[PDB]
């Protein structure tokens, strides 16, 4: 399964093209975490904007927002890590080939 | 990590640890941005010369792309672990503060 695409992507001539492809997916995932991180930063600034006590409901509402943004950040991290692994493995396969050739 | 965990879970330490985690996150982002710039430069290099490249030259360049991606994935694990820790720490407070959960 995934056989034909794999054999096609196996040829080193295709490596720089697939790399560029993966670099774009990454840049896309990066834009999303940059956005979430902007949201967290605004939340942090709200939270930090005063030293006056917050009643438990007002603090709760902030924390849920902060948490939710972090939960989405973590998922995107999962996606970047996977993609990084996959790019790493692709390049590694060619490296092992050159090594045995050398 | 009992004593630190107790510290991380103390109510008064929440704002400090939250902001600290955010800065940890910013540092990690700086590291991956830098690496991605390196990777883009190497890939751009590879793409523009790969037809006339010897095995040695192709290896030296792919090895750098691989190394850079390897570091990126590990910085990626760091961000993931950091987002999860932040998520879980805030979650304790959310459960405590929510009249339903506490």
Contacts of B65 (CB under 8 A, 6+ apart): A19, A91, B39, B42, B43, B46
Put simply, the answer to whether B98 touches A47 (Cβ < 8 Å) is no
Residues of A in contact with B70 (CB under 8 A): 88
Resolution (A): 2.3
Q: What are the residue boundaries of the structural domains of chain B, listed by start?
A: 1-102
* Cα R_g (chain B), whole angstroms: 21
Put simply, the answer to whether A56 touches B86 (Cβ < 8 Å) is no
For residue A51, CA distances in Å to A66, B6, B83 come to 18, 24, 25
Q: How far is B6 from chain A (nearest CA, A)?
A: 19
Residues of B in contact with A59 (CB under 8 A): 93, 97
CATH of domain B1-102: 6.10.140.1740
SS (H, E, C) chain B: CHHHHHHHHCHHHHHHHHHHHHHHHHHHHHHHHHHHHHHHHHHHHHHHHCCCCCHHHHHHHHHHHHHHHHHHHHHHHHHHHHHHHHHHHHHHHHHHHCCCCC
Put simply, the answer to whether A26 touches B18 (Cβ < 8 Å) is no
CA atoms within 13 A on the CB side of A5: 4
Put simply, the answer to whether B80 touches A85 (Cβ < 8 Å) is no
> Which of A44, A91, A94 minimises the CB distance to B69?
A91
A44 touching chain B per CB within 8 A: yes
How many Cβ contacts (< 8 angstroms) between chains A and B?
Answer: 103
A97 touching chain B per CB within 8 A: no
């Amino acid at each position: 399964a995934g056989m034909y695409l794999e054999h096609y992507l196996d040829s080193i001539e295709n490596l720089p093209f697939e790399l560029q492809r993966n670099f774009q997916l990454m840049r896309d995932l990066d834009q999303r975490t940059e956005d979430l991180k902007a949201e967290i930063d605004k939340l942090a600034t709200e939270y930090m904007s005063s030293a006056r006590s917050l009643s438990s409901e007002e603090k709760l509402a902030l924390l849920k927002q902060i948490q939710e943004a972090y939960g989405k950040c973590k998922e995107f991290g999962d996606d970047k890590v996977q993609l990084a692994m996959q790019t790493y493995e692709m390049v590694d396969k060619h490296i092992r080939r050159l090594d045995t050739d050398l």
